[PDB]
Design an enzyme around this catalytic site. Sequence first.
Site, PDB file in Angstrom:
ATOM      1  N   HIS A  61       0.818  -1.219   0.000  1.00 61.00           N
ATOM      2  CA  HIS A  61       0.000   0.000   0.000  1.00 61.00           C
ATOM      3  C   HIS A  61       0.854   1.273   0.000  1.00 61.00           C
ATOM      4  O   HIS A  61       0.467   2.282  -0.576  1.00 61.00           O
ATOM      5  CB  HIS A  61      -0.901   0.012   1.232  1.00 61.00           C
ATOM      6  CG  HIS A  61      -1.730  -1.222   1.388  1.00 61.00           C
ATOM      7  ND1 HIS A  61      -2.730  -1.556   0.504  1.00 61.00           N
ATOM      8  CD2 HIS A  61      -1.712  -2.197   2.327  1.00 61.00           C
ATOM      9  CE1 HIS A  61      -3.293  -2.685   0.890  1.00 61.00           C
ATOM     10  NE2 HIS A  61      -2.692  -3.098   1.990  1.00 61.00           N
ATOM     11  N   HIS A  91       5.475   6.994   6.755  1.00 62.59           N
ATOM     12  CA  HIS A  91       5.209   6.589   5.380  1.00 62.59           C
ATOM     13  C   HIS A  91       4.664   7.781   4.627  1.00 62.59           C
ATOM     14  O   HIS A  91       4.429   8.837   5.214  1.00 62.59           O
ATOM     15  CB  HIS A  91       4.198   5.466   5.360  1.00 62.59           C
ATOM     16  CG  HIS A  91       2.891   5.863   5.940  1.00 62.59           C
ATOM     17  ND1 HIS A  91       2.601   5.757   7.281  1.00 62.59           N
ATOM     18  CD2 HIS A  91       1.826   6.453   5.367  1.00 62.59           C
ATOM     19  CE1 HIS A  91       1.392   6.227   7.504  1.00 62.59           C
ATOM     20  NE2 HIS A  91       0.909   6.660   6.358  1.00 62.59           N
ATOM     21  N   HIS A  93       1.996   9.132   1.178  1.00 63.89           N
ATOM     22  CA  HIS A  93       0.980   8.947   0.139  1.00 63.89           C
ATOM     23  C   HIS A  93       1.372   9.866  -1.006  1.00 63.89           C
ATOM     24  O   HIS A  93       1.823  10.979  -0.770  1.00 63.89           O
ATOM     25  CB  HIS A  93      -0.414   9.290   0.648  1.00 63.89           C
ATOM     26  CG  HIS A  93      -0.784   8.555   1.889  1.00 63.89           C
ATOM     27  ND1 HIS A  93      -1.566   7.423   1.884  1.00 63.89           N
ATOM     28  CD2 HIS A  93      -0.428   8.759   3.173  1.00 63.89           C
ATOM     29  CE1 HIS A  93      -1.694   6.975   3.117  1.00 63.89           C
ATOM     30  NE2 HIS A  93      -1.004   7.766   3.907  1.00 63.89           N
ATOM     31  N   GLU A 103      -3.414  13.538   0.986  1.00 65.47           N
ATOM     32  CA  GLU A 103      -4.677  13.083   1.545  1.00 65.47           C
ATOM     33  C   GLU A 103      -5.440  14.293   2.061  1.00 65.47           C
ATOM     34  O   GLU A 103      -6.534  14.579   1.595  1.00 65.47           O
ATOM     35  CB  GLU A 103      -4.404  12.045   2.622  1.00 65.47           C
ATOM     36  CG  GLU A 103      -3.698  10.831   2.045  1.00 65.47           C
ATOM     37  CD  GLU A 103      -4.030   9.571   2.774  1.00 65.47           C
ATOM     38  OE1 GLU A 103      -3.761   9.521   3.980  1.00 65.47           O
ATOM     39  OE2 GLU A 103      -4.582   8.640   2.151  1.00 65.47           O
ATOM     40  N   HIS A 116       3.368  11.054   6.637  1.00 71.55           N
ATOM     41  CA  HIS A 116       2.713  10.766   7.908  1.00 71.55           C
ATOM     42  C   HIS A 116       3.687  10.137   8.869  1.00 71.55           C
ATOM     43  O   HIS A 116       4.160   9.035   8.629  1.00 71.55           O
ATOM     44  CB  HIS A 116       1.535   9.824   7.684  1.00 71.55           C
ATOM     45  CG  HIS A 116       0.400  10.480   6.967  1.00 71.55           C
ATOM     46  ND1 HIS A 116      -0.618   9.793   6.345  1.00 71.55           N
ATOM     47  CD2 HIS A 116       0.148  11.787   6.745  1.00 71.55           C
ATOM     48  CE1 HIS A 116      -1.457  10.643   5.795  1.00 71.55           C
ATOM     49  NE2 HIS A 116      -1.021  11.860   6.037  1.00 71.55           N
ATOM     50  N   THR A 195      -6.341   6.769   7.760  1.00 68.88           N
ATOM     51  CA  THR A 195      -6.825   7.021   6.397  1.00 68.88           C
ATOM     52  C   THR A 195      -6.827   5.758   5.533  1.00 68.88           C
ATOM     53  O   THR A 195      -7.166   5.829   4.353  1.00 68.88           O
ATOM     54  CB  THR A 195      -6.004   8.099   5.671  1.00 68.88           C
ATOM     55  OG1 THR A 195      -4.693   7.587   5.421  1.00 68.88           O
ATOM     56  CG2 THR A 195      -5.933   9.381   6.473  1.00 68.88           C
TER      57      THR A 195
HETATM   58  N1  75W Z   1      -0.669   1.037  10.585  1.00 73.25           N
HETATM   59  N2  75W Z   1      -1.729   1.563  10.662  1.00 73.25           N
HETATM   60  C1  75W Z   1      -1.858   2.805  10.177  1.00 73.25           C
HETATM   61  C2  75W Z   1      -1.107   3.865  10.685  1.00 73.25           C
HETATM   62  C3  75W Z   1      -1.271   5.148  10.159  1.00 73.25           C
HETATM   63  C4  75W Z   1      -2.174   5.387   9.120  1.00 73.25           C
HETATM   64  S1  75W Z   1      -2.399   6.987   8.448  1.00 73.25           S
HETATM   65  N3  75W Z   1      -2.451   6.869   6.965  1.00 73.25           N
HETATM   66  O1  75W Z   1      -3.751   7.430   8.892  1.00 73.25           O
HETATM   67  O2  75W Z   1      -1.282   7.844   8.961  1.00 73.25           O
HETATM   68  C5  75W Z   1      -2.928   4.326   8.628  1.00 73.25           C
HETATM   69  C6  75W Z   1      -2.771   3.037   9.146  1.00 73.25           C
HETATM   70 ZN    ZN Z   2      -0.831   7.748   5.990  1.00 70.49          ZN
END
Ligand code: 75W
Ligand code: ZN
Length: 257
Positions: A61, A91, A93, A103, A116, A195
């Site tokens: 992802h 990570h 997006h 996002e 993020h 998200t």
């Molecule tokens: N591992 N689980 C997660 C951690 C952060 C996010 S996000 N994209 O909201 O920062 C999503 C899933």
């Molecule tokens: Zn994220």
Amino acid sequence: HWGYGKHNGPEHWHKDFPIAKGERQSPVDIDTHTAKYDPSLKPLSVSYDQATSLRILNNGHAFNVEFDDSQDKAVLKGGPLDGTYRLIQFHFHWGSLDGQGSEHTVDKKKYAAELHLVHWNTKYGDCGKAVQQPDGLAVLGIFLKVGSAKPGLQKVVDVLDSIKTKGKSADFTNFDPRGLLPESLDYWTYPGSLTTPPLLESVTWIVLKEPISVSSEQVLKFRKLNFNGEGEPEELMVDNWRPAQPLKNRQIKASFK
Ligand SMILES: N=Nc1ccc(S(N)(=O)=O)cc1
Ligand SMILES: [Zn+2]
């Protein structure tokens, strides 16, 4: 299972994850005119001096840079937060083109990408318990625009060829996440959610106003990653962002006048 394509993307997620249509979903559009300066917000403290990165993983992802969170080494405090939140991973997006990828949006503007930095509230003992609590996580969101290169990002960019496909990981020690921050810590904050599935409503969002600049060459290397595993048909990892969700009964607060 879930992803970002036409057949498994954000419009489908509510079927396996009905909270997708909930009251505090993320991301949102930040209407800068409606966001109110909040004097009750305490100073924001990003303390990443002792951060200990471990590994980088393509999870199908996005890619995660993972940290040792077994002690208070890299923490986020202050601002809207009560207590101490420990950095566990970061990570991104990003989009297929420079005009989309973030996002969160700012007055409907989409940035090329969004970083993020994910933190969990130490009062809950581990991140798995924290994510089940309304104040369990704090995510620091940072917009990326395409311009000058971000020197602190290049070490991430250079390792991506080694984690091209889903399930691949690589050692990624001694990475300093302070090199991904902008100059200013001015921010907006609101209560929201993960998200991605499971979309749990456990996040205090802290979204920095100042974007970081990355080069076209840097973002182009993000877009060479694959959603698929090794040996499977190539599906480029692009447009791994959820669109903005209804604000509903929420107020976005600004840290700055
Ligand atoms: N591992 N689980 C997660 C951690 C952060 C996010 S996000 N994209 O909201 O920062 C999503 C899933
Ligand atoms: Zn994220």
